[PDB]
């Protein structure tokens, strides 16, 4: 063994030690992918959630920490309309956070189509989706009014009765309780049409200004990891 060979082996051992150090850090941080629309409020979340916890750039990274657990969120910007190619780079991610506006009736069908496209993608057949019905304050304001009618855009509304399993907060009119579970019903009906039991969709109701979304993401990710561990450790 020449001196050069010994030096090369020593360098390889040092690099291997550093890589082993980095592996533990890598397998302690969970990656989340954020999707939405321009009319949505994903900017509001990424602004007033990381505070409490270059011109042409594609990926924006947000780091937050809940109960000493690290989370990295990735927002996609400056890209084109096509998504069939860069969506496959996200296969080992923990969850996809879909933020949908619940007040604009004009752009609800497009949101449903986008959710259907993400749900039935070939490369995303094992990734769960956390759904955020954002800006519920405006839905209440518009519902308790006359210059609007949700029955106009969707003709199936005047056949819907509120589900028995509901938890209306005190001080909410019955009207705002009915025109609010219909949207979740549509999204979950799209979810349960296919997918078998490999992946699930978690619904939530969220306002623009609130500090609970980190807790909700933590709970959903914990459930996802629990299900993966049940599959892995030979229980189901």
């Amino acid at each position: 063994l020449s001196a050069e060979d010994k030096a090369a082996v020593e360098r390889s051992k040092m690099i291997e030690k550093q890589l082993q150090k980095d592996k533990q850090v890598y397998r302690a941080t969970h990656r989340l992918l954020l999707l939405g629309a321009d009319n949505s409020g994903k900017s509001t979340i990424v602004k007033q959630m990381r505070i409490y916890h270059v011109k042409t750039s594609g990926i924006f990274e947000t780091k937050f920490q809940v109960d000493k657990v690290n989370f990295h969120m990735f927002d996609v910007g400056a890209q084109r309309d096509e998504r069939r190619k860069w969506i496959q780079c996200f296969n080992d991610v923990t969850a996809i956070i879909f933020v949908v506006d619940s007040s604009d009736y004009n752009r609800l069908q497009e949101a449903l189509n986008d959710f259907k496209s993400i749900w039935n993608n070939r490369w995303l057949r094992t990734i769960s989706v956390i759904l955020f019905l954002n800006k519920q304050d405006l839905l209440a304001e518009k519902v308790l009014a006359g210059k609007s009618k949700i029955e106009d855009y969707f003709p199936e509304f005047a056949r819907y009765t509120t589900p028995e399993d509901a938890t209306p907060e005190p001080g909410e009119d019955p009207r705002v309780t009915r025109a609010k579970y219909f949207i979740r019903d549509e999204f979950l009906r799209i979810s349960t049409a296919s997918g078998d039991g490999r992946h699930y969709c978690y619904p939530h109701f969220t306002c623009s200004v609130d500090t609970e979304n980190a807790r909700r993401i933590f709970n959903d990710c914990r459930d996802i990891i629990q299900r993966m561990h049940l599959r892995q450790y030979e229980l189901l």
Partner: peptide, 15 residues
């Protein structure tokens, strides 16, 4: 991570 290998001896030259 970019790793620069040496195929003959399978060592690692950089990281």
């Amino acid at each position: 991570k970019l790793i620069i290998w040496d195929s003959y001896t399978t060592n690692k030259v950089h990281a």
